[PDB]
Motif scaffolding. Structure first.
Motif, PDB file in Angstrom:
ATOM      1  N   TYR A  87       3.251   3.537   1.673  1.00 31.26           N
ATOM      2  CA  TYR A  87       3.783   4.798   1.359  1.00 31.26           C
ATOM      3  C   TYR A  87       3.633   5.670   2.862  1.00 31.26           C
ATOM      4  CZ  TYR A  87       5.411   4.153  -3.326  1.00 31.26           C
ATOM      5  OH  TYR A  87       5.929   3.562  -4.592  1.00 31.26           O
ATOM      6  N   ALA A  88       2.418   5.690   3.268  1.00 31.48           N
ATOM      7  CA  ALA A  88       2.297   6.246   4.662  1.00 31.48           C
ATOM      8  C   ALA A  88       3.181   5.910   5.665  1.00 31.48           C
ATOM      9  CB  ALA A  88       1.052   6.068   4.866  1.00 31.48           C
ATOM     10  N   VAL A 107       6.972   2.847  -7.683  1.00 31.07           N
ATOM     11  CA  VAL A 107       5.871   2.162  -7.432  1.00 31.07           C
ATOM     12  C   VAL A 107       6.066   0.552  -7.584  1.00 31.07           C
ATOM     13  CG1 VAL A 107       3.314   2.011  -8.151  1.00 31.07           C
ATOM     14  CG2 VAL A 107       4.695   4.206  -8.217  1.00 31.07           C
ATOM     15  N   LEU A 108       6.497   0.091  -8.533  1.00 26.87           N
ATOM     16  CA  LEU A 108       6.875  -1.248  -8.632  1.00 26.87           C
ATOM     17  C   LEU A 108       7.713  -1.872  -7.729  1.00 26.87           C
ATOM     18  CD1 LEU A 108       6.971  -1.464 -12.690  1.00 26.87           C
ATOM     19  CD2 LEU A 108       5.053  -2.046 -11.167  1.00 26.87           C
ATOM     20  N   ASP A 109       8.628  -1.024  -7.200  1.00 26.25           N
ATOM     21  CA  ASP A 109       9.499  -1.524  -6.019  1.00 26.25           C
ATOM     22  C   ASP A 109       8.653  -1.701  -4.713  1.00 26.25           C
ATOM     23  OD1 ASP A 109      11.779  -1.596  -7.710  1.00 26.25           O
ATOM     24  OD2 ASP A 109      12.693   0.224  -6.653  1.00 26.25           O
ATOM     25  N   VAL A 125      -3.530   9.939   2.216  1.00 23.18           N
ATOM     26  CA  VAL A 125      -2.073   9.688   2.688  1.00 23.18           C
ATOM     27  C   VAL A 125      -1.567  11.304   2.610  1.00 23.18           C
ATOM     28  CG1 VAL A 125       0.086   8.876   2.502  1.00 23.18           C
ATOM     29  CG2 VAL A 125      -1.974   7.469   2.555  1.00 23.18           C
ATOM     30  N   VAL A 126      -1.544  11.792   1.420  1.00 24.96           N
ATOM     31  CA  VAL A 126      -1.009  13.175   1.120  1.00 24.96           C
ATOM     32  C   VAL A 126      -1.741  14.155   2.107  1.00 24.96           C
ATOM     33  CG1 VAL A 126      -0.703  14.990  -0.619  1.00 24.96           C
ATOM     34  CG2 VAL A 126      -0.144  12.680  -1.052  1.00 24.96           C
ATOM     35  N   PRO A 148       3.007  10.870  -6.938  1.00 24.16           N
ATOM     36  CA  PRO A 148       3.563  11.799  -5.902  1.00 24.16           C
ATOM     37  C   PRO A 148       4.075  10.997  -4.696  1.00 24.16           C
ATOM     38  CG  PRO A 148       1.542  12.625  -7.053  1.00 24.16           C
ATOM     39  CD  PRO A 148       2.009  11.270  -7.584  1.00 24.16           C
ATOM     40  N   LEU A 149       3.534  10.075  -4.038  1.00 20.38           N
ATOM     41  CA  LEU A 149       3.977   9.275  -3.022  1.00 20.38           C
ATOM     42  C   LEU A 149       5.286   8.700  -3.239  1.00 20.38           C
ATOM     43  CD1 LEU A 149       0.708   7.900  -1.577  1.00 20.38           C
ATOM     44  CD2 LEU A 149       2.087   9.520  -0.456  1.00 20.38           C
TER      45      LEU A 149
END
Ligand SMILES: *C(=N)[C@H](C[C@@H]1CCNC1=O)NC(=O)[C@@H]1Cc2ccccc2CN1C(=O)[C@@H](NC(=O)C(F)(F)F)C(C)(C)C
Ligand SMILES: *C(=N)[C@H](C[C@@H]1CCNC1=O)NC(=O)[C@@H]1Cc2ccccc2CN1C(=O)[C@@H](NC(=O)C(F)(F)F)C(C)(C)C
Lengths: 306, 306
Positions: B209-210, B261-263, B296-297, B252-253
């Motif tokens: 995600y980052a 998330v599952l993607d 990351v956040v 949140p990410l």
């Protein structure tokens, strides 16, 4: 044992960070003795970013147009001047936490610690290198300008970077603490962009010595190379030339490990030509180039700072 | 833009580091209020490292057998006690630089900053994670014990690690600040060794995600997966199971990026099965697992600390 991307302890710099506001723009400043250093673009307005005339913008300002905040305390600006791309705000109070310090302009390939700050408050610390193309691969967001980079030597903080700009590739540009940009960059919104970068060969070699010190030899070989023939390969892989001075600088690591510099060069040549074939070095699948020879000796010898 | 292995600013911890000497052994201590915390093995002698009886060793000690040095100043020990594997030395002076602080015992997979110290003087700061096998991949030499790991939250330092031991694979073992080891380890010279480690799946996903936040999508795909089918693949690659709680924590990410998330799990599955085919993510050729979702956040939002 172990080898980490290691920053200097940031406390001496934390005590120097302040917030500077001009108009609607807020960023960070560095408070040493009775002077606050910050990017001169704090005086810019949104509609005049393309080619500001900073001398013309600054002559229109008064001391009271600058708001400096250290913690919750306001510092009164009593004088100001511009030096290259930095503004120096004279304040009514000397910073009682001023460390012993120097300003240094570093060479490409040197590393330093960055204390990323927002609104005069430290956020985090990380290690970077001045790239050959005079960008840094930082981590910076809106409001980070005025964050500084530094090295510590015994008790003395050597400030070497102040953050100013982000380039279109997501890398960063800034100045020494006398306000001179590293590289061909400017504090204006124009077409500027990182030049082609190269890999810092002497640092890769240092990190290979670090790997040997820490117990890993898998990448060594029985060969040697001449400096000329090594550099012929380096050039092919977008590595910087290795000079005799680099070889001299690697002398201590060579002596500690018993591996001649040109023998380590033959090892690096083989890695460039063959890859790692699924193996890692010090936890990396890439050849790392942001450790200097001095960084390796520091971390593999436990040098301290006060 | 940018994404770096980022530590917390270390100043609040630097002000707490002292040197503790018992007999011929010197290491670091943590000075909070009028108590100095340090590894109890400071009282050991060379010939009794295999199975020291610390209660028997400590009852033979007097306050004056302990030398505590803060900078150049000696602190007089006026009481002592042992709590698990830490010694608490009561001193005649309260540390005037004591930050707001807590002691926390962290879960595996959580990250923290380490302030590596020698002879009570800070050397450097780096980020680590508590591995699933309760070792840390630190950078520590002789004399480093008593160095601590911590997180900062607003103004509050949460100490979570004190360094005690190096294991045969070059990784590290230590305690919470109440002296309880993480993992099945002991402060004695015995056959102990890291158990088999695993990769921290929820952290790898956070770092993916980052990468998307920072502008890189090359590794995404059009697929999704069930949690069960993802975990069947994870297990094959020595990844920790992903739980629904992990999925919730990544919420949140996922929301900020628009990638379920599952993607993202389907993307990770493809990377595990295919590799990166010569490409990198955030400057790494490996899947990085020492950034938590919160890390990351923090770094992608510019949270600060005072
Ligand atoms: C400082 N607070 C900030 C740091 C930036 C913001 C995003 N990531 C960073 O590192 N610096 C800026 O926003 C500068 C300031 C400035 C001065 C004069 C004229 C224009 C600007 C806008 N800034 C830029 O960094 C912009 N980059 C460029 O204009 C160029 F690519 F360098 F040419 C931009 C990131 C597009 C806002
Ligand atoms: C603290 N100063 C030091 C940190 C070490 C030294 C090298 N790298 C490090 O991280 N800790 C030790 O030397 C400990 C202390 C100790 C207490 C009781 C009994 C024996 C020791 C010796 N120490 C070790 O870490 C040793 N490791 C082990 O015995 C084991 F692998 F954990 F079992 C050793 C590294 C061999 C000295």
């Amino acid at each position: 044992s172990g080898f980490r991307k290691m920053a200097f302890p940031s406390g001496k710099v934390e005590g120097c960070m302040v917030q500077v506001t001009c108009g609607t723009t807020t960023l960070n400043g560095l408070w040493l003795d009775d002077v606050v250093y910050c990017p001169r673009h704090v005086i810019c307005t949104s509609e005049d970013m393309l080619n500001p005339n900073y001398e013309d913008l600054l002559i229109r300002k008064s001391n009271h147009n600058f708001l400096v905040q250290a913690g919750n305390v306001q510092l009164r600006v009593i004088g100001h001047s511009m030096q290259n791309c930095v503004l120096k705000l004279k304040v009514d109070t000397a910073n009682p936490k001023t460390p012993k310090y120097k300003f240094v302009r570093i060479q490409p390939g040197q590393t330093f610690s960055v204390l990323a700050c927002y609104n005069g408050s430290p956020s985090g610390v990380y290690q970077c290198a001045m790239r050959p193309n005079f960008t840094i691969k930082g981590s910076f967001l809106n409001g980070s300008c005025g964050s500084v980079g530094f090295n510590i030597d015994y008790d003395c903080v050597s400030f070497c970077y102040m953050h100013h700009m982000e380039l279109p590739t997501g890398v960063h540009a800034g100045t020494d603490l006398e306000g001179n940009f590293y590289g061909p960059f400017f504090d204006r919104q124009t077409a500027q962009a990182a030049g082609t970068d190269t890999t810092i060969t002497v640092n890769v070699l240092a990190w290979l010595y670090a790997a040997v010190i820490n117990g890993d030899r898998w990448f060594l070989n029985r060969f040697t190379t001449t400096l000329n023939d090594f550099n012929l390969v380096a050039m092919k892989y977008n590595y910087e030339p290795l000079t005799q001075d680099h070889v001299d600088i690697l002398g201590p690591l060579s002596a500690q490990t018993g591996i001649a510099v040109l023998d380590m060069c033959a090892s690096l040549k083989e890695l460039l030509q063959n890859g790692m074939n699924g193996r890692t070095i010090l936890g990396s699948a890439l050849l790392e180039d942001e450790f200097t020879p001095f960084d390796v000796v520091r971390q593999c010898s436990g040098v301290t700072f006060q």
